[model samples]
Target: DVSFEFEHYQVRLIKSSDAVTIANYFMRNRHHLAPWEPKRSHAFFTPEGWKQRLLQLVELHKHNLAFYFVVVDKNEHKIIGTVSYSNITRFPFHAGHVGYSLDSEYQGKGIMRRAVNVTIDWMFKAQNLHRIMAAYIPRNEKSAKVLAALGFVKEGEAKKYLYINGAWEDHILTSKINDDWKP
Candidate 1:
């Protein structure tokens, strides 16, 4: 339900209508994003699978548990990147974890940065989150740069933070706090 428009892009929450496009985006970037993500089941590459997944995402959104968002090419109406803030908690802890991925061709072009800029701003200001955490593998220099440029501070290193690309991987944890966060 959340949507933000940019000059040539639109960032919005995942919907049933986006099933095929989302599937295609993942298929197109499997090789590009594989190393940084968890292994996917074969079904996840199909439109039907995305349809099923979208239902769950919608349900999660209903409860404000998580959000699945996409950065779409406004003209093509196709997904070019993705950014999500998940595991959102309320009250005593207004926090969540942010994850993002950009099309290989779109990387280093500043698309991800701007897209995430609006997304994170909305989360902090609109959703009223107090802290947002992001983690990246030390080898992913681009991710390190992007988070830093977005004003995330180095928190610490987490060993075996996730099981990605087959084995346990260490991550550089970083966080951005909402300066104007209120109760």
Candidate 2:
């Protein structure tokens, strides 16, 4: 049960104070990321919209069912990215789905790999979760690479897994079992 940190970056739970910073990060990356992410109207970029969406994270955290961790560079003290656990279930299964994105300006720096690994370690060791899954549209090769780098097996692909950029797109499903995951 070891924690991870690299450079100026460390993973920590998304705080109530981070709402504005997180919202702004999403807005800035919307255009650079919209092609691969869920298509939405400009209204979804509103601060109110973000607050509404983040309420879900707060609820999940309160129940100890899931987490939403923001990636911060301590020196700069900026929100560069976020990784979250969605679809968490504890009874019949100790599993949850993962999702994340880095600010467009920060892409290609191996930041996500470090952040994802830190979060996954916390999920398994601290939270005692057994499985974690990450699904990405087939068109998102960078996401595929990041998941693979974290040692997820390419279990299968789902057709029309999500509607992205105005079309139902396929997704590559990847997962890592906690016991088998070696850091």
lDDT for every model?
0.90, 0.82
lDDT of 1: 0.90
Best by lDDT: 1
Per-residue lDDT of candidate 2, residues 49-143 (tens digit): 76776787788788887788888878877788889887888766889999998988888999999899888888888777888999988767789
- Lowest-sum lDDT 10-residue window in model 2: 1-10
Model 1, 1-183: lDDT tens per residue?
678987888999988899999999989999988888999999888999988989999999898899888999988878999998888999899999999988887777888888888899999888889999999999999888889899999999999989987799999999999989998
Deviation (Å) of 60 in candidate 1: 1.7
Candidate 2 lDDT (Cα, whole model)? 0.82
**Per-prediction tally of clashes:** 0, 0
